[PDB]
Design a binder for this molecule. Structure first.
Ligand SMILES: *[C@@H]1O[C@H](CO)[C@@H](O[C@@H]2O[C@H](CO)[C@@H](O)[C@H](O)[C@H]2NC(C)=O)[C@H](O[C@@H]2O[C@@H](C)[C@@H](O)[C@@H](O)[C@@H]2O)[C@H]1NC(C)=O
Ligand SMILES: *[C@@H]1O[C@H](CO)[C@@H](O[C@@H]2O[C@H](CO)[C@@H](O)[C@H](O)[C@H]2NC(C)=O)[C@H](O[C@@H]2O[C@@H](C)[C@@H](O)[C@@H](O)[C@@H]2O)[C@H]1NC(C)=O
Ligand SMILES: *[C@@H]1O[C@H](CO)[C@@H](O[C@@H]2O[C@H](CO)[C@@H](O)[C@H](O)[C@H]2NC(C)=O)[C@H](O[C@@H]2O[C@@H](C)[C@@H](O)[C@@H](O)[C@@H]2O)[C@H]1NC(C)=O
Ligand code: MGC
Ligand code: MGC
Ligand code: NAG
Ligand code: CA
Ligand code: CA
Ligand code: MN
Ligand code: MN
Lengths: 237, 237
């Protein structure tokens, strides 16, 4: 069992994607997770993009867990340096048919009064009380309080290439972040047992958020665009 | 407390390096692990380059194991496409004061006569009876029969950026290979317990080899140059 897809760009009314909240595909082929009006990103925005079909990460009959690899490119432009940009974007895996969670530092994937499990890779741009210096890459399991974190320097408005790989045999989730214009490379990895946190079928996708109104800073915002996205998974059992 | 070193280029007769066999430093600052005469690489070549001082990867007193990160750039030029270039290069960790092993597919780090333990990251270009398709990245522990491998496409004569990271807490060894001119990214990781395979003090370095005479093919060769190399280790205690 091998499932996979690839998007060299995105088209409006992409029957393969499920857009939620502020998520929208622009006319020039990019997936804009958060609201951007007249070339300017706004605060109080949250949006998600899920692959329409569910993927099987493990099978209870054989006990086998799937291995997978996903690559995507994104760009974050931070027009307003002061006071502070927010909030960042994440690639995540969650149960199917879920609704956008709380915005702000929760990226729209965490919902307090109805928490659902999830594994996520974050690119955090705002420092919340539970965060180390930003920006940083973090591996999140059921919480936005990363199990592992690594700092990185953003290429404002530049393109970022990300590779996320998960090997079921070792349970290692490793992510690579590369900014081709700067030649910088960041790597982070951790052990995660999908079988232990997620159900057999899940949805994979992205989620982002800009500054929350509670911060009372309209400049607390930035863009969260996805330029391309390929995904492949293999379930031997 | 712990070590750190960085070479942005190499100087003829580096007091800091221990060159063995065919390893030499060219007039223009590159470390040529295997023999290259008049711009042409030759077969039957083997060479290593070790950091002169030993590094402590773990302490028996505290039981603490070190974490480390190493980045380097290399270039492999394959002038003769047919019948098959050989053999590749590796970054390795071994006990101090060891001698060059057997060439060919053993890269000069394996010695059947008096085997010594070692952890290595290989960039295999020739397919031996124990190898999967080439080229590939492989993680080797005490043998050249990789515990884990991933295929990659070489940028002939191009520059390759490598990042090798080891986290003692998770025992995860993850390596990243990037070819900036092609924008390609390859990642591989595995669990390795240094404390269980290596002594408290070790040498770190590179080793490469070209076609062995037993193959009866003089074309079985290529260059194995190291352009730069930075290393860092952090042993708490
Ligand atoms: C919110 O973002 C605005 C756009 O970056 C900031 O205004 C810009 O502030 C610059 C000085 O840091 C100034 O040179 C720019 O001309 C100005 N841009 C314009 C025309 O709006 C804004 O900064 C506040 O407003 C400006 C006008 C000054 O009064 C600053 O002292 C203020 O901090 C940002 N506001 C905040 C809360 O950071
Ligand atoms: C492959 O490289 C080897 C390392 O230089 C060559 O070994 C020869 O070893 C001799 C003593 O062991 C030494 O005096 C020689 O300098 C050296 N090679 C020569 C002759 O320059 C090996 O050479 C072959 O094997 C040796 C034992 C001699 O019989 C040579 O005449 C052979 O050419 C190299 N093999 C080949 C096929 O090039
Ligand atoms: C070993 O590498 C040599 C250089 O790449 C090969 O020879 C070159 O082959 C080219 C076409 O394959 C030909 O246009 C070049 O002129 C020639 N260069 C030389 C050495 O004169 C060589 O290939 C064999 O020998 C050549 C001359 C041709 O006859 C080929 O058909 C032969 O396969 C390579 N040897 C092997 C075993 O591949
Ligand atoms: C004061 O914090 C809030 O506003 C910030 C931007 O001003 C950030 O958006 C920050 O994440 C958000 N906090 C939460 C919990 O959503
Ligand atoms: C036929 O195999 C041998 O020759 C090859 C090059 O022709 C390669 O050098 C290959 O690695 C080597 N084998 C060993 C075991 O070293
Ligand atoms: C934030 O957006 C929500 C829904 O998009 C809206 O109901 C709310 O009033 C907005 N907050 C402010 C103060 O703009
Ligand atoms: Ca945050
Ligand atoms: Ca080989
Ligand atoms: Mn964070
Ligand atoms: Mn191999």
């Amino acid at each position: 069992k091998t499932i996979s897809f690839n998007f060299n760009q995105f088209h409006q009314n992409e029957e393969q994607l499920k857009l939620q909240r502020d998520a929208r595909i622009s006319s020039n082929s990019v997936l804009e997770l958060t609201k951007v009006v007249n070339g300017v990103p706004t605060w109080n925005s949250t949006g998600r993009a899920l692959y329409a079909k569910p993927v099987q990460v493990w099978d209870s009959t054989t006990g086998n867990v799937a291995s997978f690899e996903t690559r995507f490119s994104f760009s974050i432009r931070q027009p307003f340096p002061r006071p502070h940009p927010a909030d960042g974007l994440v690639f995540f895996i969650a149960p199917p048919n879920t609704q956008t969670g709380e915005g702000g530092g929760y990226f729209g994937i965490y919902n307090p009064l109805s928490p659902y499990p999830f594994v996520a890779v974050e690119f955090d741009t705002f420092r919340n009380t539970w965060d180390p210096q930003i920006p940083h890459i973090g591996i999140d399991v059921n919480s936005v309080i990363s199990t592992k974190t690594v700092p990185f320097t953003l290429d404002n408005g530049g393109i970022a290439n990300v590779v996320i790989k998960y090997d079921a045999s070792t349970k290692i989730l490793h992510v690579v972040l590369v900014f081709p214009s700067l030649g910088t490379i960041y790597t982070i990895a951790d052990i995660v047992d999908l079988k232990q946190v997620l159900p057999e079928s899940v949805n994979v996708g992205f989620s982002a958020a800009t500054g929350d109104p509670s911060g009372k800073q309209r400049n607390a915002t930035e863009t969260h665009d996805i330029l391309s996205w390929s995904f492949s998974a293999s379930l031997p059992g």
